[PDB]
């Protein structure tokens, strides 16, 4: 059927795996096990279309990011994730986007900016800051919590809707 290849990128510990696992398995992963490279596949109906999501969950740790490049090359849309309590992860976003443009050899790549951990109150990235960054990229900004499930489906489905506009 119609298959969408999604890739989740961002700094170590921002919740890439927890987000993907909440989407696919409907539970919250409380522990922190750094990822090398994992993939997930699930059939879902999105806006009346039965489709297959193939999701690549990438490493945020430099030491585990061995050869992310070749795996990412086939991605059709990218979730760029930072955590709203981690200013450094937000500052790193521009570098992740540049990496995506390098592996796709294009400046026209479907992406969504995601501010995760919105259940936490120690916020150092304000919504408007992230809205401004997304605006400069021509993409949407969405906040999520892998813990409460707020916005999780919205984030991934919005990315599918972005792929459909390209």
Ligand X SMILES: Nc1nc2c(ncn2[C@@H]2O[C@H](COP(=O)(O)OP(=O)(O)NP(=O)(O)O)[C@@H](O)[C@H]2O)c(=O)[nH]1
Given a contact cutoff of 8 angstroms between Cβ atoms, the answer to whether 87 and 125 are in contact is: yes
Q: Return residues touching ligand X (CB under 6 A).
A: 12-18, 29-32, 34-35, 59-61, 116-117, 119-120, 145-147
Of 142, 73, 69, which Cα lies nearest the Cα of 112? Answer: 142
Q: Does 107 bind Ca ion (CB under 5 A)?
A: no
The answer to whether the beta carbons of residues 86 and 122 sit under 8 Å apart is no
Residue 119, contacted partner among Ca ion, Mg ion, ligand X, none, CB below 5-8 A by kind: ligand X
Q: Is 15 annotated as a binding residue?
A: yes
List beta partners, residue 4.
53
Rounded-to-10 torsion of CA 7, 11, 12, 17: -30
110 is in an annotated binding site: no
**For Ca ion, what does the binding mask look like between residues 38 and 77, x meaning CB under 5 A?**
----------------------------------------
For residues 160 and 46, is the Cβ–Cβ distance under 8 A? yes
Q: How far is the CB of 137 from ligand X (least distance, A)?
A: 20
Q: Which of 1, 26, 30, 136 binds Ca ion (CB under 5 A)?
A: 30
Q: Which two tokens stand for residue 146?
A: 């892998």
Tell me which residues touch Mg ion (CB under 5 A). 16-17, 35
């Amino acid at each position: 059927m119609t298959e969408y290849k999604l890739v989740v990128v961002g700094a170590g510990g921002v919740g890439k795996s927890a987000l993907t696992i909440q989407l696919i398995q409907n539970h919250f992963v409380d522990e922190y096990d750094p990822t090398i490279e994992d993939s997930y596949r699930k059939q879902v109906v999105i806006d009346g279309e039965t489709c297959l999501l193939d999701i690549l969950d990438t490493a945020g740790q430099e030491e585990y990011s061995a050869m992310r490049d070749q795996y990412m090359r086939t991605g059709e849309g990218f979730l760029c994730v930072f955590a709203i309590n981690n200013t450094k992860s937000f500052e790193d976003i521009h570098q992740y986007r540049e990496q995506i443009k390098r592996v796709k050899d294009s400046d026209d790549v479907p992406m969504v900016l995601v501010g995760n951990k919105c259940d936490l109150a120690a916020r150092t990235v304000e919504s408007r800051q992230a809205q401004d960054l997304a605006r400069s990229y021509g993409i949407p900004y969405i906040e999520t919590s892998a813990k409460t499930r707020q916005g999780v489906e919205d984030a991934f489905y919005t990315l599918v809707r972005e792929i459909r506009q390209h």
